[PDB]
Design a protein around this ligand. Structure first.
Ligand SMILES: [Cl-]
Ligand SMILES: [Cl-]
Ligand SMILES: [Cl-]
Ligand SMILES: [Cl-]
Ligand SMILES: [Cl-]
Lengths: 257, 255, 257, 255, 257
């Protein structure tokens, strides 16, 4: 039978990161839960830190509900994102409504591969008046790289996400890149992205994000288990401004099971 | 019925100082006693955070009737269709979205029936030509290279100095050919001579067509056999009216 | 008898520098050889480093051949620079031809002193179409400073090279400044420059290179032997960008004999 | 007519944190399709001063009628005289002063005609016995080891836990045997089974004879084939009334 | 014909080292010269540094003269060391006399290998009254290590000099270890040691010097050329005092030709 929705072959995808501080370090946890059919059912964010001599844990939950050709994603703040899905279970449009009654509308378009798996090529954000406010386009033409174009109001930026030829890592982890959920407007759809509602992740892990040039490259180093599934990602941001280099590192631990 | 390399191993080692911390890269090509490439191991050594990292990936090469099947650890299967002389005429592999990517190859056939790559064309799943590289051998001391990637076009000349030509007894390809897209996707097939024979003389300069050119100069060290032990690559660059050259040093173990 | 060519009273001028690295430091050697008549006959570049546990030395040689009113300089890559000399042996024009058949043309003009020694005042580079692509002009009007104007395509920059009044060091070493062979297009003629084919070096050593102003000054400190001949040069580049100073140091050892 | 290893490669990798800067050590043993050891490559990676260092040395193993000749890059020739079953009975090599050093070996012969080393004796050029190691297999779960180096004598017991024995399908020797003088001089011959078969079960403890013993405990990780992927070695040590244990972690690639 | 003296197959063995300072660094050079027969003929020590802005070079020369069964070594200070040699050209005794008329006497004993090459096993120093003041003994029994016993008056210390099994480097450079000429009383005979008058160096390079235990290990890392001859030695001294480690590094460059 042909599939009617994208699936994740895991029951849980969990990310853990320490957000550094010389006074109050915070451990952030992002937990994505999938049902036995492989659809995302919910997301829980957690922040853990010490205050006085006591450990505190702050939680926020996002719910995912499915209807015929629809995914309804509701966060802790009461914002409802309604995704209209095609026959294959990928969103073609989204309407987001906050508790103040403000709305945002999005369209999505895809590359459809030989197996009928969909890969996001375009996210466009419109305003109430129908004015296009932002977009991200992804081009899969380069054999081992993704060409990314971003526009946020008057800001425009192009970048390339690369996989090393001869050193490719298969994305059997089925995870998105760390940078993708931080890019506006995809940053508004992180829960839909981990649920594959906005398309499949690339078939190989990305090891470099190169913005167009002052230069600011991101390098990703992965640790895998004996199944070839990601256990951690080391991200190194190298920012250069007229021969002055400042390096920032992130370590994200993964529990994919 | 097939091209051969008279060595059992071709290994490249390089310290890359370009990154925050220096990375050591190793590229090892292994050949069987018949002279056919059987495998490739790519290695990277560096530290990331507290963790010392050693990334090691192995690609296998299998030969069938008029075929070379190149399989990596990521599960990519690249199938090269070979002609009667053992050089690829076609290649199918899988892209970032899992679609089939097709490559065609055409050659210069010399008097000794040795094939030299003249054209690599890359076609997308819809049949659209995405990129090509053409090589003109009219003057062996000045190879005319045309590259087209999407809408962008780059022409360059690869030269050998008249009277100071070094015989390529090492049977190695130039450093620049495995960095030029789409040939940069076929480094394993290139070192296996599946995509043609390397230049008969070592190339000492890569000159782009002109602006004060960002030319690459190659300097080689040879052993007592006349086989390459190291290559120094200098890319000239002008920054605020001053020469600021980028350099690479690659050590070779050819045995 | 009046001289027909410039001369260097040494048989060898050799520069040695360590190009720093926390993994693969490289020792670079630049050797200029002069015949007993004092004309430059050749240049050898050498790079020495460790790979594994073995020392490697990479060499490149440039040849200098003389004919009536001509100097032909050929590098390791096969590029031929043909200098047309005046009656005093200084180049008035140069044509450079690479192995791909690309050509570059240059004109040179000079200050002629009371002893008929020539000091470079202008290098102009033209393109095939006759379009002026770059130039460097040197003014010797200030008693103890050189005023330098550089143009490379659309880039324009002015700088001053100074000698300290009361602390002058006679240039009996007959060497050019370190910065002169790094400035484009003089950087294309380093072998001709050390051979005095492009003029005499200034009579006193330069201790400061001050570009016009973000500021980026170079200071030179020399060590001499008991003959008053240079044995080393310490070059300190001080780059300032809105109160943020980054200092870069070079040590070049000289063997002038 | 000779012992065999059913793998083509046995590789050990270790990060040594004992030194000022961490050293990465690699020991690679290669076997031919017949199962005989053909060579060894020892590698060390570290930084010394500004220079990143990579020391790499290769030892070759050649077989002749009733002989195994082990040659290193330093020009040492170690000649092992083999019996009819392919195990060494004698060895001649060259010491620090260039004198011939002689070793004799004797074995336990099991029911399947497999040989297990019981004695290694080292003799100086004058014929003086300088050292020996004897191994008693009376109890396979508690091997009695006697070592004598000059005047100093050390007795220890190598144990396997009753009911929790791991089959040595990996065909690897213990980590401690190639550290025990004079067996520490014959690591290449040991991995080639030239000096006998390894223990049928992995050894989990090395207990010296007693004082609160400086015992070594080995913990192994196996893959789905039951072949070793890593070994963790813990040496217990008491310093000012506190436990201060020394640890080693060795990763294995047995294929 | 059987040899009557030890030989070095080089004409020069030269060591260069920078003795660090944040004010007046000194470059020290130790040059050992051998005649075409392979006997040491002389030693020159050189110290080079900057004072003011001038380079200064301080030199001291030691002469080596040979007679039947004798080597006479005279330094810059006028101290004469007379070595009595055996039939193979190795010293069995030495008498040293300074300009004040003070004398020191030494005996030497050796391991004689199958090729009749001699390796030092014992140096004993006596006083005028015949009282043994110091000794160094070297044992070659361990296949890949040297066991060293030292006694200087009431001070006694044992150490082990090791070669790594499976990673041996042949001593085709024919050089002694760096530590051997720093150990008293062998430190009084450095010129005789480089001339092989006090025996052959070990057949493999030493990579570690381990004193008996507070611990103080020396590690040696060598760089070789394509002939397998030493070009440099990196020596790292690791001193530990109750969990407090202080590391000292030396880099000695070699010119062996
Ligand atoms: Cl951009
Ligand atoms: Cl072009
Ligand atoms: Cl300006
Ligand atoms: Cl005991
Ligand atoms: Cl002691």
């Amino acid at each position: 039978e042909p599939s009617t929705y994208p699936t994740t072959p895991f029951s849980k995808i969990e990310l853990k990161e320490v957000i550094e501080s010389d006074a109050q370090p915070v451990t952030a946890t992002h937990t994505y839960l999938y049902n036995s059919a492989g659809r995302l059912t919910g997301y829980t964010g957690k922040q853990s830190f010490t205050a006085g001599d006591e450990l505190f844990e702050i939680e926020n939950t996002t719910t995912v509900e499915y209807k015929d050709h629809q995914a309804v994603i509701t966060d802790e703040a009461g914002t409802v994102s309604t995704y209209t899905l095609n026959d294959k279970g990928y969103a073609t449009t989204c309407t987001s409504q906050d508790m103040a009654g403000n709305t945002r509308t999005y369209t999505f378009s895809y590359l459809i591969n030989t197996e009928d798996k969909y890969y996001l090529e375009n996210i466009t954000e419109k305003l109430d008046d129908g004015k296009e406010y932002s977009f991200i386009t992804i081009d899969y033409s380069n054999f081992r790289a993704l060409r990314i174009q971003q526009k946020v109001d008057t800001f425009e930026h192009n970048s390339t996400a690369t996989t090393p030829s001869g050193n490719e890592i298969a994305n059997i982890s089925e995870i998105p890149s760390l940078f993708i959920t931080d890019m506006y407007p995809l940053s508004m759809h992180a829960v839909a992205i981990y649920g594959k509602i906005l398309g499949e992740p690339a078939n190989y892990l990305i090891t470099q994000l190169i913005p167009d040039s002052s230069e600011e490259t991101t390098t990703y180093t992965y640790t895998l288990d004996n199944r070839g599934i990601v256990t951690s990602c080391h991200a190194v941001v190298r920012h250069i401004r007229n021969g002055y280099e400042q390096d920032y590192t992130r370590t994200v631990n993964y529990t994919i099971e």
